[PDB]
């Protein structure tokens, strides 16, 4: 989050919140019949909030999320939609013939290269792409 | 009633807004203060050294020293160094010393006397002005004598020479001598120190000349001021022993007053207001002018004055519009303020017995015949005299 | 030994019947 930026920000919102509350106790304009224009205020300012609790299947059990219902394909070369030590369990998951690299032997358990099914095509696989030689 | 109420409601509400606005300033809102002053405090407290051992700052020497008396029991000759200046220190105050090695860190705090706390009572009369009417001429005089030379300098400066230095309020109680002292003091807002005369004669000897000089000297320091000496008849009347009565005790107290008021030691434009119910006990030297200036005499209430004196007592209670004032003037007259208080109390007393919780004309009338007789009875009737 | 056993004897019926209702509750509660 980084602490410093919040501290400037907090002061601003807050000073307003308490000042608005000051205006609410103060009523004189219960009696009035104004249309002549200059005010046309309620002469009270207030604030409030409401928020909803939910967020779907947060954790399966008390322990971490692990396997969960609803299925995804995740492409390789993703670690901003990463593989986890919580995902060995997940792998398999009634895999499709649209995956041309699919299981053929067991599990790798925590990570490694895993079996790619006997390929007849290279449509799903993507060509070579190292960042090795552009580093320097 | 209804006319007042809209403004009353608004004043309480304006004050609410004022309270609530303070909270937002101490908690969130900062611009010069910031995180920065917080750190200034930490840094100053650690250098300064907590605990700070209290001293009293009697005087400052300009060379980077001060003469301090530490309040622990043994005094120290400290340096003025660290977070204070010579001028920043003020005389007769409490100061902070570094605990490890005493140098005077500074004056945040002021020192109040032990004496002054007991003596002092707050200024304001419970009977509002222009409703201590009745000897209405007399009420005005005190406002002219004690209050005015402090309130308005213009007349005095053109008049020239020495101003007033007191008033003496004398004559039978109930003509409101205490209410008057409090009024002038309220108006000026001069520290009102109050001591009963009986404190001047207590068991210990020489306490009288001691208390009175300290009281005045404290009034000069906290000046401008009003000293009220309430009911100085006790000097002769009281004795805890032979030494506490008698001439030595009476003289020493009188003698002190004479030097203090106009004499060598003098006083400033600080006024002494004396209440006395007897100037029989009081000397011709404290009834002498130019340390009393105008004396105020209250005489017994007159037939017409008595109706106005009665109104004041009636205002403190519930307001009458059904009491016959003539019956009171007819029954007794050329009797004190204290007699009008006596008619009022007795009416309240009969109503209390029934558990009637008001006074009416009826309560005043029933009680009034017994009270007049009772006045005569207060002084001995013996067997049949 | 006597004191505890007497406390146990009154508590028993209460504690043992309730167990089945709490047990079921726990398994469901755990998931969220």
UniProtKB/Swiss-Prot annotation, chain A:
Chain spans, region Disordered: 22-64, 113-136
Composition skew (Basic and acidic residues), residue ranges: 25-35, 42-55
Highest taxon in the source lineage: Eukaryota
Post-translational modification Phosphothreonine, affected residues: 13
Residue positions, PTM Phosphoserine: 17
Record field: compositional bias (Acidic residues): 119-136
Coiled-coil ranges per UniProt: none
Role this protein plays: Component of the 26S proteasome, a multiprotein complex involved in the ATP-dependent degradation of ubiquitinated proteins. This complex plays a key role in the maintenance of protein homeostasis by removing misfolded or damaged proteins, which could impair cellular functions, and by removing proteins whose functions are no longer required. Therefore, the proteasome participates in numerous cellular processes, including cell cycle progression, apoptosis, or DNA damage repair.
Complexes and interactors: Component of the 19S proteasome regulatory particle complex. The 26S proteasome consists of a 20S core particle (CP) and two 19S regulatory subunits (RP). The regulatory particle is made of a lid composed of 9 subunits, a base containing 6 ATPases and few additional components including PSMD1. Interacts with ADRM1. Interacts with ZFAND1.
Entry similarity comment: Belongs to the proteasome subunit S1 family.
Protein name: 26S proteasome non-ATPase regulatory subunit 1
Annotated source species: Rattus norvegicus (Rat)
Curated annotation (Swiss-Prot), chain B:
UniProt key word Nucleotide-binding: yes
Classification via CDD domains: RecA-like_PAN_like
GO MF term list: ATP binding; ATP hydrolysis activity; proteasome-activating activity; TBP-class protein binding
InterPro entries per UniProt: 26S_Proteasome_ATPase, AAA+_ATPase, AAA_lid_3, ATPase_AAA_core, ATPase_AAA_CS, NA-bd_OB-fold, P-loop_NTPase, Prot_ATP_ID_OB_2nd
Domain of life: Eukaryota
Family per record: Belongs to the AAA ATPase family.
Descriptive protein name: 26S proteasome regulatory subunit 4
Species classification: Eukaryota, Metazoa, Chordata, Craniata, Vertebrata
Gene that encodes the chain: Psmc1
